[PDB]
Assembly symmetry: D3
Homo-oligomer: 161 residues x 6
């Protein structure tokens, strides 16, 4: 079973959008969101990846309690939120904590309730609504196999460097 | 200058939607929102009102720091968010704290930045997006005079009882 | 399907043990726990009940986000934690929010993961460990039917008054 | 040993100054402080008192963890902060939780460290510095006996009504 | 228009005074303040500066929501709080987030309300009141031009190294 | 008087167990505890130590207000919690902030109230109760001298490397 380290940038419940400078590893405030919205899960990126858009591959991690920005979480994928924004491809791997038996019933995208998946989708569809020249189109859920392959190829691209 | 007491039900930043039972005065959890959204201001209702829809008149209060549910705040109106939902009329009076000189520059709807007003509007336009058979249409900002008249007539309707 | 109002006294995560004075309805700090423990769910009591011990019947409510003390939550039972302490019978009805489709898959005690139920049990087994002359014995989970009957008879006892 | 109920209005760490309407028992936001200061202890008033200034007698309660506004705490006095402000006499009884053995070593004003007492004094000396026509003079610590007598006489004044 | 990176050490609302070790970049707890006061804005220092006192130049950043210690914020100056303490010169650049149109109306020190500026001043005037052998004198607000020049010369001093 | 730097991993009140990767210095989420328990003090490790078990020496730091994970605190020891777990020796040095006169009355293990020491012990005795193949035996408090010697020898072991 695949697993990897996610650096969490943004705790669940946050309207401050934090990024990491990937040169330094410093956490940065990107912006306070222009919409009255809050990240619906802990959000970050997979360490040692180069995604389909030239940045590290983004990840959403389901947690019982949020963490702080910059914290590492060992995670395994169960699906992916596929999307294109003004930046091009901007896919998000849905994960759960690896090696934690309390998540053993969550193996694939169909094991995550529709209410959670719709909520996550709603966030990404709408959070940029009041920023002009920023859209999102092609927004879909895909299964674990598709998530694994995208992580796989983004690990290879990182190594080719 | 008009002023009144607002009972705050929902602090700013909250995804739990609290109501008051107006028979008892008890605070109740209505629901946890189905959208990844958070109340953009402290939200409640004006005491001793009967609004255009038969409930107390709703109010949004701009505060430097949120309060707890059930707290009274003496407030004065500066504008109103006019809207119709599945319940019919569901207008919200925009207020600031009364008798507080730090808010003396905020007198009318044009004294509130567009970014705040758009954010508030976005909340009310979208927070019910994942609840079926719940829409909102006719969503507009109106000035202080219109707010005063609606409070005025809702105070009179309460007294006629 | 049975439902009722729970007044939440103690949010999940709390080490302050709050009670309600049932004469007045005032919230009171009973004590700060003597153990390094925290209420594992939102905790309160069912309004209009007289339990098997002469106090209102206690309830645990599973919520996506905790509420504040004194808030009402409409809830339905899915099981019960049966126990006897130094006070005699001190049973706790396990509930979920009523009329909320996100909880429709949780119908009976077997629909709640063992890790949650063990955690709840551990709290009640151990939280009084450093208070002398306070024990708990006979600690067991029972199903929804048993919970319904105990609520039923505690509603009747309240009415006979 | 004397004890009484304190209704806490303001948790420790707060810059929102909450009051209770003593007619209704409703919690109200008085104001957000004009100084960058925060209440150094949980702050409220003793129920069923009429102090030397015609309001209920104010109390400071030392707690391991703050409570919410409107919560009752059974407390016993260990000293008093004597002061006169623009309102005249505005004394504050220093208390600890009653019937709690973890506070048994705190019996009188000399059992409270000077750093706490200086901090409390500093708050009350300075929190109104940026509100014009509001001063405080005559600010002193006095012992438990003086605190008891002031509670005593304020209970009698309440009863004479 | 000038801009720079501020490393925030202390979120707004905090009574823990955090510093950065500039050798390592580690965040350190300097002390819990001896006064019942709380940092009135997010507080840190400008990266790649050597101020008039041989430490990095301090900055206050006005934010809609505080950040965590160690977070970078791209900021632009609008004024400066000029002061001398027991350490000699200890000036603080007042900033707002750079490239954020919600702050475009805040260009110079006169665009910041007097109530904020007085509050900030009150903090720095009083927070060391209960630490002996620590004073502050010469405390004044100066405009953006003066702030720019001090940043300018502190950047040059850093480069000469 | 001995002092040292503690890197705090876990703030007081936390049910998320954070660790540091000692290779990188990155903070990691180890796990969310399986018990309804919360760290009773701020918890971390002494920098530049190699304890009796081959990891850095663990420390508990008594603070007036918790810090964030990864923050350094200069501390001095007053005692130690001696224990063996499934990992072998897993001792914890009890500390207070160094160079802070508010802690000058806390010099040795007998200056810490029994209620705190029992609470800390209860945490470590019970927090792994629902993780199988994880026990703790031999759990005792020892005085400052014993703490100093263990730090001493763990500093020497770090240097021999
Ligand atoms: C009652 N029911 C079906 C329930 N399932 C879960 C659960 C199943 C698989 C993972 N989780 C999980 C979700 C969120 C946090 C932690 C674990 N969690 C709960 N909780 C009240 C925490 N309830
Ligand atoms: C820098 N500038 C134009 C600014 N204006 C205000 C302000 C003007 C009128 C009311 N408020 C207000 C808004 C929110 C909270 C409190 C007061 N507040 C700030 N703050 C940083 C608090 N900055
Ligand atoms: C991934 N999985 C099985 C999951 N199930 C639930 C869930 C099922 C039934 C009720 N709940 C529930 C539990 C706690 C809070 C809200 C709802 N919730 C989650 N969350 C991450 C919130 N995950
Ligand atoms: C280490 N020492 C002398 C200490 N004393 C107390 C204490 C003595 C009497 C009352 N308290 C008390 C103070 C605040 C909260 C709770 C209890 N508390 C602590 N704590 C770390 C909580 N330490
Ligand atoms: C109603 N009035 C004059 C107002 N102005 C501002 C504002 C103007 C320029 C900057 N800010 C600002 C201040 C603090 C946070 C964010 C933005 N902000 C508010 N808020 C209620 C947030 N109100
Ligand atoms: C009333 N009494 C005996 C008391 N002692 C202390 C105290 C003595 C030595 C250290 N601490 C200390 C403990 C926890 C936090 C900060 C300092 N602290 C308090 N507080 C209410 C903070 N009370
Ligand atoms: Ca990013
Ligand atoms: Ca970006
Ligand atoms: Ca857009
Ligand atoms: Ca309502
Ligand atoms: Ca409703
Ligand atoms: Ca809808
Ligand atoms: Ca109870
Ligand atoms: Ca009790
Ligand atoms: Ca016991
Ligand atoms: Ca008062
Ligand atoms: Ca008043
Ligand atoms: Ca004054
Ligand atoms: Ca500094
Ligand atoms: Ca310093
Ligand atoms: Ca001084
Ligand atoms: Ca560790
Ligand atoms: Ca480990
Ligand atoms: Ca075990």
């Amino acid at each position: 079973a695949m697993q990897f380290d996610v650096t969490i940038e943004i705790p669940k419940g946050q309207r401050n959008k934090y990024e990491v400078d990937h040169e330094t590893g410093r956490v940065r405030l990107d912006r306070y969101l222009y919409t009255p919205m809050a990240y619906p899960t802990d959000y970050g990126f997979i360490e040692d990846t180069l995604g389909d858009d030239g940045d590290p591959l983004d990840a959403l991690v389901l947690l019982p309690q949020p963490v702080f920005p910059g914290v590492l979480v060992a995670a395994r994928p169960v699906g992916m939120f596929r999307m294109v924004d003004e930046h091009g491809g901007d896919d998000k791997v849905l994960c759960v904590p690896a090696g934690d038996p309390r998540w053993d019933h969550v193996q694939d995208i169909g094991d995550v309730p529709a209410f959670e998946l719709d909520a996550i989708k709603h966030f990404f569809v709408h959070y940029k609504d009041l920023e002009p020249g920023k859209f999102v189109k092609a927004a879909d859920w895909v299964d674990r196999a598709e998530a694994e392959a995208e992580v796989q190829r983004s690990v290879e691209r990182f190594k080719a460097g």
